[model samples]
Target: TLENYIHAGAYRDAIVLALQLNHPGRLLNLFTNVVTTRNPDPDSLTGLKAVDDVLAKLSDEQIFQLLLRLRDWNTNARTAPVAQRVLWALFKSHPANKLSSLSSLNEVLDAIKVYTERHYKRIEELVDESYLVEYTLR
Candidate 1:
C-alpha cells in the first residue's frame, strides 16, 4: 500500500505514512527527493503545491513528528538547509497560534534556534575561507 502510492508519485500522502509508520529514514529520503528535486515548481513551498497543502493540513502529532525530524537533522550542518526549507514551509503554512502551544515545542524550537546559529556561524567562516581558497587555487 505504501509503495503503491509512493512509487505512483503521491508525494504528499506518502510522507504521512512514512511518519506515521515510524520511518524517519524514509521520511528523510522523501525530504531529500523534493529539496534536491531536478525540476522545481514555480511559486510553491516544499517545491510542490501538494506537499505544501500537506504541510498546512497536518495533525498536531504529525507536526510534532516533523519537528522531531528537524531537530535531529538541524544538529548536523550538512542538513541544516534541508531543515530550514522544511521549517520555512511549515511556518508559512501554520502560524504559532495554529502550531502546537504545548511546552514540548519549547525545547524543540530552542534546540533548533541554538544549532541554527552555530551552523550559520560555521558556514560563514567556511564560506569566507572558500573565497580565499578559490583565489589562491587560481
Candidate 2:
C-alpha cells in the first residue's frame, strides 16, 4: 500500500508509484516530506538523491508538470527553499535546450525570478529593521 511504502521510507518506490498513478497530490506530499526533513544526508536514497532519480526518469510532460508545481511552491516563502533546491538539481541534471523547449518556459522562469527577487528584498528589509532595532536599543 502507498502508506506502507511511505512509512517504510521507500522514497523511490513511493515516488514512482505516485508518478505512475498520476497522483500529483501524493507526489507533492512526498516531496514536501523530503524537503522539510531535518538533516537529511546529501547522498541518501530518501532525500535529494531520490528526487534526482525521479526527475531523471520522468517524461517531458511529467517534467513540465513538476516544474509548474515547483514554481507554485517557490512563490511561497515557507516552501521556497525546497522548490529552489529541487530546481537547482533539475537544472544541473538536464540540458539547457531541453528545459528551454518546455511550453511557456519563459513565463515560468519569469514568475520564479519575480518571487525570488521579492524574497530577497524581504530579507534585506528584515536586516535593515534589525539594525534599526539595534540602534534603538543602544
The candidate maximizing TM-score is 1
Q: Ten consecutive residues with minimal summed lDDT in candidate 2?
A: 19-28
lDDT for each residue of candidate 2 in 39-138, tens digit (9 for 90 to 100): 7778544465666776777678767777777778876787787677777777888788877775477777788888878877988999988898889889
lDDT per residue as tens, model 1, 4-114: 656545655677788787654678778878877787876688777777877777877888888888889897767778888988899888877867575377888899889
Task: Report residue 82 deviation for candidate 2 (angstroms).
Answer: 1.6
Per-model C-alpha lDDT, please? Answer: 0.79, 0.72
TM-score, cand. 1 vs. native? 0.78
Clash count, one per candidate: 0, 0
Error of 1 at 120 (Å): 1.6
The C-alpha stretches of model 2 lying farther than 4 A from their native spots are 1-13, 16-24, 43-48, 124-138
